[model samples]
Target: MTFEEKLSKIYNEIANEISSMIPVEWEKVYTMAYIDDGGGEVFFNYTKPDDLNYYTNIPKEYNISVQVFDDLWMDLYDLFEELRDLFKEEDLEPWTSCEFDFTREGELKVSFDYIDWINSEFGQIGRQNYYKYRKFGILPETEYEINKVKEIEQYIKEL
Candidate 1:
């Protein structure tokens, strides 16, 4: 497959798997991903049809909204690996924020908001999110971060 074709394939797989957990009532799915310096994660959420109060990546920047489910992000680690490998194979380093809007019926639209890492607040926000990944929104908190701050969650912290 072509690079874009491969991307769509894996993204479709990711989206299709995600569709399984999402409620049918929440007919539309939105995933926001910020990839910089060859890495980042995607946060997936849902909204209903014709809802004016929909969540937006533009407002929240790199943060996540009320998500489909907790730790759902981790379930896509395999897909992420596939994507990363694909990116490596393609030799295209993407430093941008992208949105994937899709439906339960498998229709998807993608839009990119390229990042200005050297002179933008998005650079700051996106940088911090990657640095302290445990504090990031892509993963559902396991209370590990809070407990670690309070000196808890035990030796699992070392790993």
Candidate 2:
């Protein structure tokens, strides 16, 4: 496929992914998520408040790092901006954590306690019922957006 085709598909998938974030419990509150370019790998870091206890074993943060080919940095950056815009259009606030570049020495890598409020089903019966009443967890038709992004990553490698 042509570069334009690749970028188009990626942009579409990214928009879909952002749209699917309706079920998100918190984007600017209590939790944060960011993308960083780590050499050949791209890292998606989702961090929660550091004050939470870890006896739950859910970990304080979630990190997904995938190897990506070079020359795609500009494309990825563009997609990132597109995602940010989609977040805004959806009325989703951006994460509050300060953004930083990838560190090869891992010196700046900070980890915090993150609670996955979406799947964990946190809160009392009243709160849960309230969210359910609002159809909060109801996924969008674009649920496959995450997988689509993965496919785009693979396609970038193939290119």
Candidate 3:
């Protein structure tokens, strides 16, 4: 196929993929924290406490390990905003590259790393229930999107 055709195909697939995120099912997609040893919670502080963003900067990196659950999740929840700002300094490529990229044809390509990430980490543990409850299907169909992905699985077996 021509480059235009390839891009059209990819675009259609991406559109179909994106269309699946709607009609939000709040219960299934969102995760809640429980007081347990298996999982832990973090705290947030805001730079603009009165403002809606309420995003503050974190002065340092430290761990909040509490023996008691009742203790403050943080001195302030606005630290969540600080965490958001910290991400601004980070290289979004390593994160977004796994989700979207540019094709040689100038079209965008979804990263293979993201496909592996979802199938392995997010697929099995956290998202299965989310799909069943909220969206009723997986948001991103990586397998269908990449024709060569199945080959990747076969290639792994040979190695």
Candidate 4:
């Protein structure tokens, strides 16, 4: 299958395999992008769910970014914290956004060594609930998705 097709398939698989672990109102949206392959190749990275809508590539500025939107930014913050807690609960590596700083060469390079989910080498890293979503049919019994983060999950109770 093509890259996008693979992502769509992952989404469908997640919706069925791990439905209960998800927050009742959250979603699954797949965000797609091509990342530099370290050896110069630009390979596809299709790790997102099916509910996402934005993809930004700023080669002249920074690496690409992908995300989903709730009704407000507060929701996003709450969800992120919830996801962090999920990582803790699952005993998986929690993820942090990649960071870049000016180098002596006057260039910027972003290396997310902590990212190990989807096509990443750190397959157990990133948002706690995404590993299951990305694995999908490949690991049907272990996949999950989060449609929302609410007041009772503890992860978002104070957010």
The digit string of per-residue lDDT tens for model 3 on 49-113 reads 12211011211222323322222233212232232233344533222111222222345343222
Instruction: By lDDT, rank the candidates, best first.
Output: 1, 2, 4, 3
Prediction 1 TM-score vs. true: 0.51
lDDT of each: 0.54, 0.32, 0.28, 0.30
Question: RMSD in angstroms, all models?
Answer: 12.2, 19.3, 20.1, 19.7
- After superposition, the stretches of candidate 1 with alpha carbons farther than 4 Å from their true spots are 52-69, 77-81, 104-106, 118-159
| Candidate 1 C-alpha RMSD relative to the actual structure | 12.2
Poorest lDDT segment (10 consecutive residues) of candidate 2: 37-46
Best by lDDT: 1
Which candidate do you rate higher for lDDT, 2 or 4?
A: 2
Identify the superior model by TM-score, candidate 2 or candidate 3. 2
Model 4: which ten-residue window has the lowest total lDDT?
Answer: 38-47
Candidate 4 lDDT tens digits, 1-159: 554454345434432322222223323322211122221111111223242212122222233222221222233333334434454566766554322222223343332234322343322222323333442422223223233111112333333
TM-score of each: 0.51, 0.22, 0.19, 0.21
Task: Report the error of model 3 at residue 133, Å.
Answer: 23
Compared with the true structure, the alpha-carbon lDDT of candidate 1 equals 0.54
